[PDB]
Design an enzyme around this catalytic site. Sequence first.
Site, mmCIF file in Angstrom:
data_model
loop_
_atom_site.group_PDB
_atom_site.id
_atom_site.type_symbol
_atom_site.label_atom_id
_atom_site.label_comp_id
_atom_site.label_asym_id
_atom_site.label_seq_id
_atom_site.Cartn_x
_atom_site.Cartn_y
_atom_site.Cartn_z
ATOM 1 C CG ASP A 1 -4.269 -16.881 0.929
ATOM 2 O OD1 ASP A 1 -3.135 -17.090 0.743
ATOM 3 O OD2 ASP A 1 -5.001 -15.986 1.404
ATOM 4 C CD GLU B 1 0.619 -16.846 1.789
ATOM 5 O OE1 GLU B 1 -0.276 -16.163 1.471
ATOM 6 O OE2 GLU B 1 1.811 -16.782 1.659
ATOM 7 C CE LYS C 1 -6.414 -10.223 1.958
ATOM 8 N NZ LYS C 1 -4.964 -10.411 1.760
HETATM 9 O O1 LIG Z 1 1.916 -6.227 7.081
HETATM 10 C C1 LIG Z 1 1.750 -7.256 7.709
HETATM 11 O O2 LIG Z 1 2.095 -7.634 8.677
HETATM 12 C C2 LIG Z 1 1.269 -8.341 6.789
HETATM 13 C C3 LIG Z 1 0.518 -7.916 5.550
HETATM 14 C C4 LIG Z 1 -0.175 -8.883 4.776
HETATM 15 C C5 LIG Z 1 -0.015 -10.303 4.800
HETATM 16 C C6 LIG Z 1 -0.666 -11.333 4.063
HETATM 17 C C7 LIG Z 1 -2.096 -11.292 3.897
HETATM 18 C C8 LIG Z 1 -2.941 -12.020 3.238
HETATM 19 O O3 LIG Z 1 -4.044 -12.230 3.124
HETATM 20 C C9 LIG Z 1 -2.090 -13.023 2.275
HETATM 21 O O4 LIG Z 1 -2.546 -14.014 1.449
HETATM 22 N N1 LIG Z 1 -0.760 -12.951 2.335
HETATM 23 C C10 LIG Z 1 0.046 -12.171 3.037
HETATM 24 C C11 LIG Z 1 1.526 -12.259 3.052
HETATM 25 C C12 LIG Z 1 2.295 -13.630 3.283
HETATM 26 C C13 LIG Z 1 3.448 -13.843 3.328
HETATM 27 C C14 LIG Z 1 4.318 -12.549 3.060
HETATM 28 F F1 LIG Z 1 5.513 -12.748 2.892
HETATM 29 C C15 LIG Z 1 3.665 -11.322 2.569
HETATM 30 C C16 LIG Z 1 2.434 -11.096 2.937
HETATM 31 C C17 LIG Z 1 0.686 -10.567 6.010
HETATM 32 C C18 LIG Z 1 1.295 -9.742 6.650
HETATM 33 MG MG LIG Z 2 1.739 -15.160 0.180
HETATM 34 MN MN LIG Z 3 -4.604 -13.998 2.246
HETATM 35 MN MN LIG Z 4 -1.627 -15.413 0.264
#
Ligand SMILES: O=C(O)c1ccc(-c2cc(O)c(=O)[nH]c2-c2ccc(F)cc2)cc1
Ligand SMILES: [Mg+2]
Ligand SMILES: [Mn+2]
Ligand SMILES: [Mn+2]
Length: 202
Positions: free
Chosen positions: A113, A85, A139
């Site tokens: 991640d 990530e 998930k």
């Molecule tokens: O709607 C929201 O507020 C939101 C949804 C999902 C994520 C997310 C979650 C995760 O587990 C991940 O690995 N990643 C992400 C992730 C990380 C970076 C991004 F640009 C987009 C999603 C974060 C926020």
């Molecule tokens: Mg990501």
């Molecule tokens: Mn995640």
């Molecule tokens: Mn991620």
Amino acid sequence: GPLGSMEDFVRQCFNPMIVELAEKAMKEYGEDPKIETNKFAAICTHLEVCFMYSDFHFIDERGESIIVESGDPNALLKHRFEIIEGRDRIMAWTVVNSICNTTGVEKPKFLPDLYDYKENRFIEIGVTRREVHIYYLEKANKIKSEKTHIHIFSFTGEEMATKADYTLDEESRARIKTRLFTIRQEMASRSLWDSFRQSERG
Ligand SMILES: O=C(O)c1ccc(-c2cc(O)c(=O)[nH]c2-c2ccc(F)cc2)cc1
Ligand SMILES: [Mg+2]
Ligand SMILES: [Mn+2]
Ligand SMILES: [Mn+2]
């Protein structure tokens, strides 16, 4: 009290590195940090949890896991976790492919991640504003592989991990949970928490 802006909160309570990586990510997927502000704060929170999950964990000269909480890591130590990530798409998949072709671990179909060199498995970190159990199943439904380990955190201290295997010691996970509590409390003092919590969808 007066309603603050989520923008001000993110830039003041998160390290500039995290904020920058979060901004670049949102740009890559076509969302503006200054409009999708709740998502901006959620990305920063998730990313910080990923970093805190990996902080201080090394593998020593004998090849076993140990914690070094000081900023002086002996040169022969290797980081226990690879962080996926926060990287752009190309670099993230470059790291993934490198790990897979090296360890034989089959390639995941979604970007995870972290990768754990001790347990020899990828990790999907989750930070939910809702019940951990509900979010875990969400998930999992995206991972019919069963090889990627899942570990979910909530802002109220609950956890859920695959096969009740939580990977880290209690003190490491307590640091994460304490940070999530601080985030929730500060958002609340700025009257940002209610909207932030209700904005999660799935
Ligand atoms: O709607 C929201 O507020 C939101 C949804 C999902 C994520 C997310 C979650 C995760 O587990 C991940 O690995 N990643 C992400 C992730 C990380 C970076 C991004 F640009 C987009 C999603 C974060 C926020
Ligand atoms: Mg990501
Ligand atoms: Mn995640
Ligand atoms: Mn991620």
